[PDB]
Every structure is written in C-alpha cells, then in structure tokens.
Design an enzyme around this catalytic site. Structure first.
Site, PDB file in Angstrom:
ATOM      1  CE1 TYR A   1      40.562  43.271  37.083  1.00 22.00           C
ATOM      2  CE2 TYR A   1      38.578  42.100  36.435  1.00 22.00           C
ATOM      3  CZ  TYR A   1      39.265  42.883  37.339  1.00 22.00           C
ATOM      4  OH  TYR A   1      38.649  43.277  38.504  1.00 22.00           O
TER       5      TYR A   1
ATOM      6  CG  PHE B   1      31.735  37.881  35.323  1.00 19.11           C
ATOM      7  CD1 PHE B   1      31.979  37.110  34.197  1.00 19.11           C
ATOM      8  CD2 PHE B   1      32.706  37.935  36.314  1.00 19.11           C
ATOM      9  CE1 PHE B   1      33.175  36.439  34.048  1.00 19.11           C
ATOM     10  CE2 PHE B   1      33.904  37.270  36.168  1.00 19.11           C
ATOM     11  CZ  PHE B   1      34.139  36.519  35.033  1.00 19.11           C
ATOM     12  CG  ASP B   2      35.203  42.033  37.454  1.00 20.21           C
ATOM     13  OD1 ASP B   2      35.051  43.271  37.498  1.00 20.21           O
ATOM     14  OD2 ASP B   2      35.964  41.417  38.228  1.00 20.21           O
TER      15      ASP B   2
ATOM     16  CB  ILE C   1      41.053  32.303  40.201  1.00 20.22           C
ATOM     17  CG1 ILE C   1      41.275  33.015  38.868  1.00 20.22           C
ATOM     18  CG2 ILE C   1      39.849  32.870  40.930  1.00 20.22           C
ATOM     19  CD1 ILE C   1      40.209  32.790  37.836  1.00 20.22           C
TER      20      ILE C   1
ATOM     21  CE1 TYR D   1      35.319  32.247  43.251  1.00 24.45           C
ATOM     22  CE2 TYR D   1      36.131  32.779  41.062  1.00 24.45           C
ATOM     23  CZ  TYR D   1      36.015  33.083  42.400  1.00 24.45           C
ATOM     24  OH  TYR D   1      36.601  34.227  42.888  1.00 24.45           O
TER      25      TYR D   1
ATOM     26  CG  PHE E   1      39.337  36.127  32.444  1.00 22.63           C
ATOM     27  CD1 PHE E   1      38.742  37.067  33.269  1.00 22.63           C
ATOM     28  CD2 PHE E   1      39.348  34.801  32.837  1.00 22.63           C
ATOM     29  CE1 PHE E   1      38.166  36.690  34.463  1.00 22.63           C
ATOM     30  CE2 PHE E   1      38.776  34.415  34.031  1.00 22.63           C
ATOM     31  CZ  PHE E   1      38.182  35.360  34.845  1.00 22.63           C
TER      32      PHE E   1
END
Length: 107
Positions: free
Chosen positions: A26, A36-37, A56, A82, A99
C-alpha cells in the site's frame, strides 16, 4: 462508500475470503495533500489477515473486492476511517483518504 478504480492486470478470480492472510504494497495519499504512509519505503509489505478489524473499514471492503496482481485506487470516505476523530497529528478530522493498493499475496 468504497470506490474501486482498478488498474487492470492480474487474474480477476483469486478473491479474498475469511481465514486468509494477505500482503499489500500500500501507499498512503491525502486528498489535496501529500503522502503520509508507504509500505514501499520500509520494504516490509504489511502481512495481515482478513476480518479481525485490524485495518480501517474502507480498506477492508476495498481489499476484499480485488484479486491477485490487481492494482486498485481507493477513495475511503471519512465516516469509515477517521472523519469523526482523525489520527492525532497524522490524519485531520473529516479527511478523505487515497490509497495505491496492490495485492501480491498468499492464501
């Protein structure tokens, strides 16, 4: 509302079920924002199973609607991940997530 936009190639049949541990390369992306990731940066491609509410809600349905080798494009709604709270410092409240998901797994 999980919205799938698959980049084609794969097999289109190897579908995720319960009791199956799978592997995803991912990459997080903020809508109107930066990254962010990224599992691709750590080179440890996030081995995880299905159904135990680890991830999630938006990532859970989008991974199940894929197959082996496929490359989707998630759009996770705020109310499934979130958008009420927001992860502290990393995810703001009422945020919509992007994503890059590729399933290269077993089981």
């Amino acid at each position: 509302g999980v919205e799938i936009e698959t980049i084609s190639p794969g097999d289109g049949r190897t579908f995720p079920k319960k009791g199956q541990t799978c592997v995803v390369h991912y990459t997080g992306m903020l809508q109107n924002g930066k990254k962010f990731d990224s599992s691709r940066d750590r080179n440890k491609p996030f081995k995880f199973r299905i159904g135990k509410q680890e991830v999630i809600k938006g990532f859970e349905e989008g991974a199940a609607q894929m197959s082996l080798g496929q490359r989707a494009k998630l759009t996770c709604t705020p109310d499934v991940a979130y958008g009420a709270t927001g992860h502290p410092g990393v995810i703001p409240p009422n945020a919509t997530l992007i994503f890059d998901v590729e399933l290269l797994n077993l089981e």
